[PDB]
């Protein structure tokens, strides 16, 4: 299967309450492995996975210092962006960055991405060709012209295609026990009488990894979007994920309904039915 | 006030100091034919350099000195390109091409640090 390394950054300005809060998290696939919180006492990049603890002090010095530079850039970006949009300094605002690289099933570079947002709306993003940019409005077009001059996409591309995928490969290898795994969903079905003329069938998918999964209900072979509830795939807290799909069916017709579960850990999709 | 600003200027001077040290360590290894060894020292050199250049980006706002705002931006101009060629060195597999990128990286890094030292001296007078 494919693999990804993604860094997520958030900076929230706090007018009148000090410097911006800065939170950085690093992910390999659906597994977080580093954190940094500008409010935390350590002022260091901290491990979030056991395999990243193998890295010696040189790694943690380098990552701490670079995540320090990330916060300092965002702290300036907040002041710059407030001026771009003619906003007052008393209002709180957010900048969010996400960059990283994908590899294919052959661990060769597949995709690179660098996305930037302001107040939750898309600001600027590096295109798939890793050489040009997409701007969302006139302010982001100003940023695009600045980064086109400083040859920022040239630096990002060299990092994404090379250093990024090399650290992703190394992470996959050191954390092979947990990163190169697929936990198939442990499934079951529940039944609840909503009325004397109705009943809710809930199809469960528990303790699966990765988070990508597909839950669909069918009535006599036909997919059933109406009267069906899907919840967001939620984390169990132990590194696995959960999801359920419910449908309110006419009582006595529960055998007409089937749940279908698709996951990377299933060699064939599962079919569940009230038994 | 300005007291904490002067302390940051001293920390920048030390980071630029450590940066010059590893820059020469990488140039020495390049003259010995150890390309991969020099790339690692250039990594540390660039790390200390990055820390020194953000302080002045903050200073260009905490002082509003346009002459300082010009020095820092040009120092970013060359640090960005030095980081660019550092990543190109790590991406290429040709030994000659990799050594060429380590050379180009140290060049933009030396030019960047030189403008960083000038920005420290100009900021030092403004805080006095």
């Amino acid at each position: 299967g494919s693999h990804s390394m993604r860094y997520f950054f958030t900076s929230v300005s706090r007018p009148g309450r000090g410097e911006p809060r800065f939170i950085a998290v690093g992910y390999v696939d659906d597994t977080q492995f580093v954190r940094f919180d500008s409010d935390a006492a350590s002022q260091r990049m901290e491990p979030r996975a056991p395999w990243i603890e193998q890295e010696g002090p040189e790694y943690w010095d380098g990552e701490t210092r670079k995540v320090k530079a990330h916060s300092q850039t965002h702290r300036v970006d907040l002041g710059t962006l407030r001026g771009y949009y003619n906003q007052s300094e008393a209002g709180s605002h957010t900048v969010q960055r996400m960059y990283g690289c994908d590899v294919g099933s052959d661990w060769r570079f597949l995709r690179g991405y660098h996305q930037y947002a302001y107040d939750g709306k898309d600001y600027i993003a590096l295109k798939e060709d890793l050489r040009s940019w997409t701007a969302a409005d006139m302010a982001a077009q100003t940023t695009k012209h600045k980064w086109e001059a400083a040859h920022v996409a040239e630096q990002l591309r060299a990092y994404l295609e090379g250093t990024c995928v090399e650290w992703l490969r190394r992470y996959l290898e050191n954390g092979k026990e947990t990163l190169q795994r697929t936990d198939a969903p442990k499934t079951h079905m529940t039944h609840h009488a909503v009325s004397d003329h109705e009943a809710t069938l809930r199809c469960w998918a528990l303790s699966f990894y990765p988070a990508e999964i597909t839950l669909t209900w069918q009535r006599d072979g036909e997919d059933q979007t109406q009267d069906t509830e899907l919840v967001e795939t939620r984390p169990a807290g132990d590194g696995t994920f959960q999801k359920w799909a419910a449908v309110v069916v006419p009582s006595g017709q529960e055998q007409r309904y089937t749940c279908h579960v698709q996951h990377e850990g299933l060699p064939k999709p599962l079919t569940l039915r009230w038994e | 006030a300005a007291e904490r600003l002067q302390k940051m200027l001293e920390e920048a001077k030390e980071l630029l100091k450590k940066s010059k040290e590893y820059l020469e360590k990488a140039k020495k290894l390049l003259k010995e034919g150890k390309v991969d060894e020099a790339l690692k020292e250039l990594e540390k050199a660039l790390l200390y350099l990055v820390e020194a250049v953000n302080l002045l980006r903050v200073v260009s706002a905490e002082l509003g000195d346009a002459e300082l705002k010009a020095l820092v931006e040009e120092a970013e101009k060359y640090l960005n390109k030095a980081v660019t060629y550092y990543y190109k060195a790590k991406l290429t597999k040709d030994p000659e091409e990799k050594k060429k990128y380590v050379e180009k990286s140290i060049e933009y890094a030396e030019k960047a640090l030189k403008i960083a030292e000038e920005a420290v001296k100009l900021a030092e007078k403004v805080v006095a």
Binding site: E63 | N80, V83
Partner: peptide
């Protein structure tokens, strides 16, 4: 591993 340098907007 993180980017070494990120340019301001």
């Amino acid at each position: 591993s993180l980017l070494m340098w990120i340019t301001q907007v």
